Every structure is written in structure tokens, then in C-alpha cells.
CSV table of C-alpha atoms and ligand atoms in Angstrom, one decimal:
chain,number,residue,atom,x,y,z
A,1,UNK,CA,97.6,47.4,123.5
A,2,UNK,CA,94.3,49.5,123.4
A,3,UNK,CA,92.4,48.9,119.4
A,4,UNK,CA,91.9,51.9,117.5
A,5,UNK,CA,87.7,51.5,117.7
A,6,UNK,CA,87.8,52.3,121.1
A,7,UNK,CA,90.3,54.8,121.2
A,8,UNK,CA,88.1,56.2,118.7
A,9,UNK,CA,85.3,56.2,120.6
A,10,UNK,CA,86.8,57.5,123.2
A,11,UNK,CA,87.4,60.7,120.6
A,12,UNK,CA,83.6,60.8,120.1
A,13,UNK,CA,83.0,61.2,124.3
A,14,UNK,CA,85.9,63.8,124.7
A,15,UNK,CA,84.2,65.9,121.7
A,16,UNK,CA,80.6,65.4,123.0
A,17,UNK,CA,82.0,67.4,126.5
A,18,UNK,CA,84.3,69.9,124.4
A,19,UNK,CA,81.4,70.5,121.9
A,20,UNK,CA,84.8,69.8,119.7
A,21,UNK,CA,85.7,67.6,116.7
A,22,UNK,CA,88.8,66.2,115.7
A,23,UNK,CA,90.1,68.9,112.9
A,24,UNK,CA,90.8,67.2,109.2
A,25,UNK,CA,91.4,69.4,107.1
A,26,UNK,CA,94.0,72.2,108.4
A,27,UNK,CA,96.1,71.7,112.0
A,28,UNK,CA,95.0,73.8,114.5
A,29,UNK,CA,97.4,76.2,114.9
A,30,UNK,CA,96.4,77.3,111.7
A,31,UNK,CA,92.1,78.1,112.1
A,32,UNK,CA,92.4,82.0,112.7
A,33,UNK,CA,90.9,82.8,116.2
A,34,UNK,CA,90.0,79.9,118.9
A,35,UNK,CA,87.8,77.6,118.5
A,36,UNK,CA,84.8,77.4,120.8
A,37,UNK,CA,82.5,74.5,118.6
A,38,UNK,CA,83.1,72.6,115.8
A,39,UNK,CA,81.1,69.7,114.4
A,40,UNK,CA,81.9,68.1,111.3
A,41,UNK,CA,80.3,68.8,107.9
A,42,UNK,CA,77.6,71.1,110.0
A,43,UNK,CA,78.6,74.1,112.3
A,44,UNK,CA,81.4,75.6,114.0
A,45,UNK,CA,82.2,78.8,116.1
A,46,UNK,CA,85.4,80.6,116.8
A,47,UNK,CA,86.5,83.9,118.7
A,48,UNK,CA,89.3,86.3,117.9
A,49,UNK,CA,90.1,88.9,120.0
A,50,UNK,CA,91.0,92.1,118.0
A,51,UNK,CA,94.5,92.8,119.4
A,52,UNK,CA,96.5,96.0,118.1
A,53,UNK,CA,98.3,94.1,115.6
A,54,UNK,CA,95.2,93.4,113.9
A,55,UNK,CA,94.1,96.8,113.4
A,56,UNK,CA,95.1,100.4,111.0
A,57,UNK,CA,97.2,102.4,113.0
A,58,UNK,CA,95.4,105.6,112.4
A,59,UNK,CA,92.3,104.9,114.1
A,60,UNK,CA,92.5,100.9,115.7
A,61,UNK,CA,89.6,99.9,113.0
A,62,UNK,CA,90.3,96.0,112.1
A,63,UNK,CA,91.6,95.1,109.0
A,64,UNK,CA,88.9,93.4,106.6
A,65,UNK,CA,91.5,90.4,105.8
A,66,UNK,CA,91.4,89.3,109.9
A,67,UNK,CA,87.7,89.3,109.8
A,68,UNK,CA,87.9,87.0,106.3
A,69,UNK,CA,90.6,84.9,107.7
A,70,UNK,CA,88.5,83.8,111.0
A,71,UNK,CA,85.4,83.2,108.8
A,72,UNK,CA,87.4,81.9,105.7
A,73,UNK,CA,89.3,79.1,108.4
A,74,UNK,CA,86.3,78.2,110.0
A,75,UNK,CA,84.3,77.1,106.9
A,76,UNK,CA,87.7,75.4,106.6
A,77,UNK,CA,87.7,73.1,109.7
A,78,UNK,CA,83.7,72.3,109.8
A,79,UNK,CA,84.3,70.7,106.4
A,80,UNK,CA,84.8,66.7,107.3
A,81,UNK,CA,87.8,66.1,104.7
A,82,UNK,CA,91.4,65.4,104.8
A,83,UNK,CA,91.1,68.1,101.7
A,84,UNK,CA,89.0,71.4,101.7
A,85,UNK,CA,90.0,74.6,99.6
A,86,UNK,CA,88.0,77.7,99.4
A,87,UNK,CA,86.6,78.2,95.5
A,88,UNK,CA,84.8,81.1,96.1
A,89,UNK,CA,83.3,83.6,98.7
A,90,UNK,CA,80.8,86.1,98.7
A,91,UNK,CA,81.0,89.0,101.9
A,92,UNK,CA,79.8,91.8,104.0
A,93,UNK,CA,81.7,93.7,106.1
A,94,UNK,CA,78.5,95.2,107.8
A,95,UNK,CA,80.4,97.4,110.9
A,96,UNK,CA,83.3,98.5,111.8
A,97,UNK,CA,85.1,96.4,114.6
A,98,UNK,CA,86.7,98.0,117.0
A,99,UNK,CA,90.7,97.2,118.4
A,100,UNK,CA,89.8,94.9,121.6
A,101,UNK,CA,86.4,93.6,120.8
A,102,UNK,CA,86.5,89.9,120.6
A,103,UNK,CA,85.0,88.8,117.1
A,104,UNK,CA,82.4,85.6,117.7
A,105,UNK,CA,81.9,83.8,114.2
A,106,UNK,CA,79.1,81.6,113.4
A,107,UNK,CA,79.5,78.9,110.7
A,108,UNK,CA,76.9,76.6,109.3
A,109,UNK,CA,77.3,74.5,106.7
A,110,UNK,CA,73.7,75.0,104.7
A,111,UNK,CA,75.0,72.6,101.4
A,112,UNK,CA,77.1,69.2,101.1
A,113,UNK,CA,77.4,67.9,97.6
A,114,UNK,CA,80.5,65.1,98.6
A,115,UNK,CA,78.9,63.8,95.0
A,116,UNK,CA,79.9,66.6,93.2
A,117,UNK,CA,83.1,67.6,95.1
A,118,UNK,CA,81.2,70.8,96.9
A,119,UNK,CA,79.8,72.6,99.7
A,120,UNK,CA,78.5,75.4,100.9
A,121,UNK,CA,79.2,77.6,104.3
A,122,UNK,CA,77.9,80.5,106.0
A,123,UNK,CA,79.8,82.8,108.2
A,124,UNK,CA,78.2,85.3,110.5
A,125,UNK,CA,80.2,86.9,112.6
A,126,UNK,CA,79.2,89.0,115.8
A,127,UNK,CA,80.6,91.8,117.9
A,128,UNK,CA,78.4,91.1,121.2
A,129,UNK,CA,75.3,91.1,119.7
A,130,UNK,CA,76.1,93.0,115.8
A,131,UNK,CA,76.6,91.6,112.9
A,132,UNK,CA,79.8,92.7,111.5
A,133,UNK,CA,80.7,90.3,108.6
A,134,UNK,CA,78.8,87.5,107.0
A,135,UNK,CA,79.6,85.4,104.1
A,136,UNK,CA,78.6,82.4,101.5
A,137,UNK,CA,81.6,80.4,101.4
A,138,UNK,CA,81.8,77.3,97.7
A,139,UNK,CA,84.2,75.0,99.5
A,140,UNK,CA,86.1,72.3,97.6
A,141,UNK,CA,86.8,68.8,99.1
A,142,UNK,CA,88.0,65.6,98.6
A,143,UNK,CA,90.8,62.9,99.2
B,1,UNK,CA,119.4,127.8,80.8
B,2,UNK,CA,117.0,128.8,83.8
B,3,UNK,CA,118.4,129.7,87.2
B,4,UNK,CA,118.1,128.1,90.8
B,5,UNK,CA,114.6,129.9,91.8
B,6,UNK,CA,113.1,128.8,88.7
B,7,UNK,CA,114.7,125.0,88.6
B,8,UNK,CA,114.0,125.2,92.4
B,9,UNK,CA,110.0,126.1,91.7
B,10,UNK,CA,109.5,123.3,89.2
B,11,UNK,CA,111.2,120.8,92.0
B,12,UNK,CA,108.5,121.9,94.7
B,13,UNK,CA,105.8,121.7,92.5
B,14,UNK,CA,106.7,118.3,91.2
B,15,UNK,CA,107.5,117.6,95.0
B,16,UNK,CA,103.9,118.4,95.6
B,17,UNK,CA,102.1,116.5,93.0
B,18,UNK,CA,104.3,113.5,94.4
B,19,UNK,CA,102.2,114.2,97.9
B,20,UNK,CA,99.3,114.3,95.9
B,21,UNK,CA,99.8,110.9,94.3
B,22,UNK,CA,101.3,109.1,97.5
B,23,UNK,CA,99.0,106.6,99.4
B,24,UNK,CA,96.1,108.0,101.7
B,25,UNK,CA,94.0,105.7,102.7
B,26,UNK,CA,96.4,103.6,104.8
B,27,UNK,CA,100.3,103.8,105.6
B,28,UNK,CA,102.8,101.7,103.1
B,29,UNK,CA,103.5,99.6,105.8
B,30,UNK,CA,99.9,98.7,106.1
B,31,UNK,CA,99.6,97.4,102.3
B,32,UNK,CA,100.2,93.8,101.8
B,33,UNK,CA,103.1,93.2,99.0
B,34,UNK,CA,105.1,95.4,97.5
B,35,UNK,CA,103.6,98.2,95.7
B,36,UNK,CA,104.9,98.3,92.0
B,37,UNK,CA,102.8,101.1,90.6
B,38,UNK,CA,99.9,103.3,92.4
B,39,UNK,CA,98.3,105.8,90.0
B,40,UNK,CA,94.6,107.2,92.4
B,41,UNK,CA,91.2,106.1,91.9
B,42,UNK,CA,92.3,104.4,88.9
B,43,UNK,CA,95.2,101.3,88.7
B,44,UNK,CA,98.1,99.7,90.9
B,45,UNK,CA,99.9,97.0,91.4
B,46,UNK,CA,101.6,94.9,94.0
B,47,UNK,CA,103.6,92.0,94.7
B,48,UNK,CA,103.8,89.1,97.3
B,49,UNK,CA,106.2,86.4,97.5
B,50,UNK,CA,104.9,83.6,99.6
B,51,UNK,CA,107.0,82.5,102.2
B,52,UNK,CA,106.9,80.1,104.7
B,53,UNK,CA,104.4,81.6,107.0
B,54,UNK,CA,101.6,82.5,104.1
B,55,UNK,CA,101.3,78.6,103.3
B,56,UNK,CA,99.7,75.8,104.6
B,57,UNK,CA,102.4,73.1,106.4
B,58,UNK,CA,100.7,70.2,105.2
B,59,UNK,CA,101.5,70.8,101.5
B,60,UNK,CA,102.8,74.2,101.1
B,61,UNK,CA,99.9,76.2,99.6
B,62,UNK,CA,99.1,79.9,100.4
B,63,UNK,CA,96.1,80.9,102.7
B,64,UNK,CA,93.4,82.2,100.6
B,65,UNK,CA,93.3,84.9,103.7
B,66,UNK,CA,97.1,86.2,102.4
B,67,UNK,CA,96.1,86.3,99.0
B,68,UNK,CA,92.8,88.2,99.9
B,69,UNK,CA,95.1,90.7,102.5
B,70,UNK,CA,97.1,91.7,99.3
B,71,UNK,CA,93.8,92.4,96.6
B,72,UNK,CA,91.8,94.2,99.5
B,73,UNK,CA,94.7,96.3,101.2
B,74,UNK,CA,95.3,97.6,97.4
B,75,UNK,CA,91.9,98.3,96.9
B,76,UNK,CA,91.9,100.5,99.7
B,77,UNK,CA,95.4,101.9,98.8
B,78,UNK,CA,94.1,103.3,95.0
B,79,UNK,CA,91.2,104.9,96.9
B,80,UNK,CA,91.7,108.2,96.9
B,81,UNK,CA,90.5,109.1,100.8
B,82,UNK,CA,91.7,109.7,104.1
B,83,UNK,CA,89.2,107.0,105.0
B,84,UNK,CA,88.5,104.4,102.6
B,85,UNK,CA,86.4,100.4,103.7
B,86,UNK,CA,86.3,97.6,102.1
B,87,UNK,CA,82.0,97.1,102.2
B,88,UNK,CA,81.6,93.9,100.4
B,89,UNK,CA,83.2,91.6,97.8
B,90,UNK,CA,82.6,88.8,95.7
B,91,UNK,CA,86.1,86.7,94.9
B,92,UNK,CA,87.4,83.5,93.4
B,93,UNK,CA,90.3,81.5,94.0
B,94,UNK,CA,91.2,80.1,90.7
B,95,UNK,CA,94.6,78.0,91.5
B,96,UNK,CA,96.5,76.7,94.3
B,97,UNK,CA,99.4,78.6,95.3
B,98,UNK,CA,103.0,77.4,96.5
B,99,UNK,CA,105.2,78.6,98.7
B,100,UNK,CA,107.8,80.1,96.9
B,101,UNK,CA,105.6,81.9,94.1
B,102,UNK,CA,105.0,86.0,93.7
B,103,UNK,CA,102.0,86.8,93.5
B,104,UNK,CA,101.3,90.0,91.2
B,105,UNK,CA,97.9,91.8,92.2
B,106,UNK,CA,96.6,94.0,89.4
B,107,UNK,CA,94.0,96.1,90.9
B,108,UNK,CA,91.9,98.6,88.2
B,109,UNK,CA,88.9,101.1,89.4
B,110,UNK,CA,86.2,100.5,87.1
B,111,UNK,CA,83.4,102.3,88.4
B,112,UNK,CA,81.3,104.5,91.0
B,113,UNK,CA,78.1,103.3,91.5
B,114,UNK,CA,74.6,105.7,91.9
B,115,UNK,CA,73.0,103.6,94.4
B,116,UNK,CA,75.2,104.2,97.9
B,117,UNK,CA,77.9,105.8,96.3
B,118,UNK,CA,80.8,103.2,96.1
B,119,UNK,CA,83.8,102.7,94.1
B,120,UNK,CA,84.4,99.5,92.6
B,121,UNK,CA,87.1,97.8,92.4
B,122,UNK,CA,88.3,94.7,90.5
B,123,UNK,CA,91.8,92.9,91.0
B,124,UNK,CA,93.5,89.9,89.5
B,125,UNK,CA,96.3,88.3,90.7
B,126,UNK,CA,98.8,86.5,88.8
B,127,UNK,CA,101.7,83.7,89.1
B,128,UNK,CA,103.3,83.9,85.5
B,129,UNK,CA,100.2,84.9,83.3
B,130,UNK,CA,98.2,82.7,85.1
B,131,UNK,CA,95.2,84.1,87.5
B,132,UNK,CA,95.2,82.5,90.9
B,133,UNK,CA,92.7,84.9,92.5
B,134,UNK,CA,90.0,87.7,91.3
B,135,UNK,CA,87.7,89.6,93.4
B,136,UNK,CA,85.5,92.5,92.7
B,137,UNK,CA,85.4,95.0,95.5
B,138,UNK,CA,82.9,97.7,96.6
B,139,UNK,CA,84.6,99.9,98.7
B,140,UNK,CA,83.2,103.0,100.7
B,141,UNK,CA,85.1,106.5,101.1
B,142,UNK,CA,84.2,110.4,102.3
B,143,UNK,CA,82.7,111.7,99.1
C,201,MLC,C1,78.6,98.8,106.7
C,201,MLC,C2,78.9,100.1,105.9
C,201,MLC,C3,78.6,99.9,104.4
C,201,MLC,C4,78.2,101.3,106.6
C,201,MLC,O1,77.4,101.9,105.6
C,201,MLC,P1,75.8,101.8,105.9
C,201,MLC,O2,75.2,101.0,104.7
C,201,MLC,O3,75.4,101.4,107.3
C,201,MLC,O4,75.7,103.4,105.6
C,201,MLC,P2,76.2,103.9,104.1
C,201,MLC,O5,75.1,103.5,103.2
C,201,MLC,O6,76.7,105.4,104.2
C,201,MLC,O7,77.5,103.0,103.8
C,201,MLC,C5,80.3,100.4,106.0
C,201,MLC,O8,80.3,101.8,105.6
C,201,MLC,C6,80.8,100.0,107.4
C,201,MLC,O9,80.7,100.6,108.4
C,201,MLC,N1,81.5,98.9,107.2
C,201,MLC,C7,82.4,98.1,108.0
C,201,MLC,C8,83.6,98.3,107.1
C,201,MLC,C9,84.8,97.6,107.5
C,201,MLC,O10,85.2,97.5,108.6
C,201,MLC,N2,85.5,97.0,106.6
C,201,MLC,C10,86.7,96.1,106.7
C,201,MLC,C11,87.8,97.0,107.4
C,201,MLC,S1,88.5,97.9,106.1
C,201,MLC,C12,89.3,96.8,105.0
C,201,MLC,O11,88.9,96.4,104.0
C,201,MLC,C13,90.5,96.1,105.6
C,201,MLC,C14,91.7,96.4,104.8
C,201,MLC,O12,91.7,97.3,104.0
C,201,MLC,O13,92.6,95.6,105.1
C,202,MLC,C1,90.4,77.0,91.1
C,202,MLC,C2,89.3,76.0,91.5
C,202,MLC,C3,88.0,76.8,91.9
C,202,MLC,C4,89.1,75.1,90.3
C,202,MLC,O1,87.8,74.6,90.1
C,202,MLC,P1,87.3,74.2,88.6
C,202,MLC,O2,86.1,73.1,88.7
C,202,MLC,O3,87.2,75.4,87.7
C,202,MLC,O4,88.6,73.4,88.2
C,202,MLC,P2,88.6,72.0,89.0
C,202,MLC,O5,88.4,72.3,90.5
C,202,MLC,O6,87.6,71.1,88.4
C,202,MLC,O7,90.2,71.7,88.6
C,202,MLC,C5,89.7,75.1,92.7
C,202,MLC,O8,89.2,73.7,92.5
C,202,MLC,C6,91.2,75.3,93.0
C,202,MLC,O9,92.1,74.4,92.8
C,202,MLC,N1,91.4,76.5,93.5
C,202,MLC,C7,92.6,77.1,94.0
C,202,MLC,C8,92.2,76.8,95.5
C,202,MLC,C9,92.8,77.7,96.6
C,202,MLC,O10,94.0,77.7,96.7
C,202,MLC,N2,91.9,78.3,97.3
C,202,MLC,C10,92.1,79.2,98.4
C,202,MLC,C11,93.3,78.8,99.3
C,202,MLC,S1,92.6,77.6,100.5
C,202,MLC,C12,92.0,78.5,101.8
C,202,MLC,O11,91.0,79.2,101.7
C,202,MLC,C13,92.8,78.3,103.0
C,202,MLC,C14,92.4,79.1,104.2
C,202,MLC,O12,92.7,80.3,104.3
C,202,MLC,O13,91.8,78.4,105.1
């Protein structure tokens, strides 16, 4: 016996203290790395940490597709949609990271177009204070 | 016709040029899919079948990250190079895919570039003869 506005609104106050939105578009299990922010249709930040079964055997460098993934999921969840899909992407793997450094991406979402069934996300990802890997994500949405 | 030392010194040099044609750049194991063909610096292809774990569990489509893991790692398996990075790419996912599909990567090398020395290059991936992803990859080496 509690109505769904105010158990909603309680959702807004627990995501103003966790700096965390409800996800929509993928379940959570399934962003790659953990989620530190994430508002809606605007900007998000995750952190992976760089374990050995991320990395090439010969010399614990971290495979490009982990990097991608964290950035790729991220510009996932940000997107405020039952339904986003990744059309395109555009990268840079800028430095090596390194078997246990923790990965820090930055999205921001710099383009809606809900109009024209679009938008646009940028990843930057960090290593302390390096960039390692950005990107200019053409999301899909829409249900 | 021809003894054992001679049929013997055809087998070791044939033996050899296998090691010469054999992956460097990462270990089998390391390659996402199934390599079908892998001819250096020039062509290869791979196969993924997409199981429960590359997909999605609302609706059963594959990660873009998976399909990006298999055209990357084969870009850096037709490198010929102890060391061989993946330094930027520009890709497109073209159609959704299901669990249960294959997914044939066709990678070709289709250039070397003047201006900071990379190899490019592009890959296609297929379900039937239809293209589900392509991505053209600049990748760095030792040379
Ligand atoms: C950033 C660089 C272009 C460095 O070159 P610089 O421009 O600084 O110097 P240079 O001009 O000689 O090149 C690249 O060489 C580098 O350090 N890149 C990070 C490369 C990387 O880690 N890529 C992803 C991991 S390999 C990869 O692609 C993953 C995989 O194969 O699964
Ligand atoms: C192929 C499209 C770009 C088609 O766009 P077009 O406008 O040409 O055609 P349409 O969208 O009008 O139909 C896309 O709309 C589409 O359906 N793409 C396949 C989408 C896909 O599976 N993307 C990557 C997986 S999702 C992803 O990126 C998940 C993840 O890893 O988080």
C-alpha cells in the first residue's frame, strides 16, 4: 500500500546520494566495470580494474576489447531508453594499460536527437591521470 | 624415388615455413573465434558462435564488445610482429546479432601508411552473406 509516485520519488533521493540512476537500457551485471556515476541521457563514470584475465600473457598489456567494452557499456547505460544499441564508434587507444591499474572512464553525452532516433557519447578513459582510450560513440534508441 | 635424407629435408623445411606462417603477435588461445585461414600481413579469417554469455539476457543479442574482440584480436593476429597494437579504429555495427549465430570475421591488410607507419586493416563480419559489423583498423608494430 505505498503509490508508485512516491516510491518513485523516493528513487530520485537514493540516486541524488549515490550520484546513481536507475539503469534502462542493459541490467547491471552487464555494464563492464563498476559504476561510480550515472545520470541519464548526460554523464556517467565507471572503473575496471585490470585483472590478469584481462590482459596478453606475454607481457600483462590489456586487451583493446576490455578497454572498448567499459567505454562501449557506459555510453550504453547513460542513454535514458528501455532501447539503446551502439551504430557506430570512433577510438583511440592512446597508452598502453598496464595488468592492475584500475581504468576510470568518463562518458558524456555531447548529442540527443530522441527526434531522429540518435545520440552521441564520448568516452575518455583515464589511467590516474593519462588518457588511455577515448571515443565518439552514434548510439541508437527507442521503445 | 628420393630417399629418407632428402624426403626428410623437404619435411623440415616445409616444417619451417609452417613456423614462419604461424601466429606471432599473440598466442591462439588469445584470438577470439576460431581461426579458419591466417596467411601474414595480408588476409584471415575467423569464426565465433554466440553463445549464451556473448548476448544480451533481455533479448538475446550479441555485445557489440564480443563482436569487436573477434575483428581486433584478428587484426592483431595477421600482423606480422612480435608486438603488434591496435592504435585506433573506426567501426559500424550494421545488424543485430542473436544468440545462436556464427559470426565469420574476414579480415584483409590493405595498406601501410607514410605518416606514422601503420598497417591498416579492414574486417567484415558476416552471418550468412550478410555484414553485421565492419571496422577499419590502424594498428602499430616494430618496423
Ligand atoms: C598510443 C600509441 C599510438 C603510441 O604511439 P605514439 O603516437 O605515442 O608514438 P608512435 O607515433 O611511435 O606510435 C600506441 O603505439 C600505444 O602506446 N598505444 C596503446 C595501444 C594499446 O594498448 N592498444 C590496445 C591493446 S592491443 C589490442 O588491440 C587488444 C587486442 O589485440 O585484443
Ligand atoms: C545497423 C544499424 C546501424 C542500422 O541503422 P540504419 O538507419 O542503416 O538502418 P535502421 O537503423 O534505420 O534499420 C542499427 O540501427 C542496427 O540495428 N544495428 C545493429 C546494432 C547492434 O547490434 N549494435 C551493437 C550491439 S549493441 C552494444 O553495443 C551492446 C554493448 O556492448 O553494450
Amino acid at each position: 500500500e505505498l503509490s508508485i509516485p512516491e516510491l518513485r520519488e523516493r528513487i530520485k533521493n537514493v540516486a541524488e546520494k549515490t550520484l546513481e540512476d536507475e539503469v534502462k537500457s542493459l541490467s547491471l551485471d552487464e555494464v563492464i566495470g563498476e559504476i561510480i556515476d550515472l545520470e541519464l541521457d548526460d554523464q556517467a563514470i565507471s572503473i575496471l580494474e585490470i585483472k590478469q584475465e584481462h590482459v596478453f600473457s606475454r607481457n600483462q598489456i590489456a586487451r583493446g576489447h576490455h578497454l572498448f567494452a567499459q567505454a562501449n557499456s557506459l555510453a550504453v547505460a547513460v542513454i535514458d531508453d528501455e532501447l539503446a544499441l551502439t551504430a557506430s564508434a570512433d577510438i583511440r587507444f592512446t597508452r598502453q594499460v598496464k595488468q592492475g591499474e584500475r581504468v576510470v572512464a568518463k562518458a558524456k553525452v555531447t548529442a540527443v536527437e530522441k527526434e531522429k532516433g540518435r545520440t552521441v557519447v564520448e568516452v575518455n578513459s583515464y589511467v590516474g591521470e593519462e588518457i588511455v582510450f577515448s571515443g565518439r560513440f552514434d548510439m541508437y534508441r527507442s521503445k
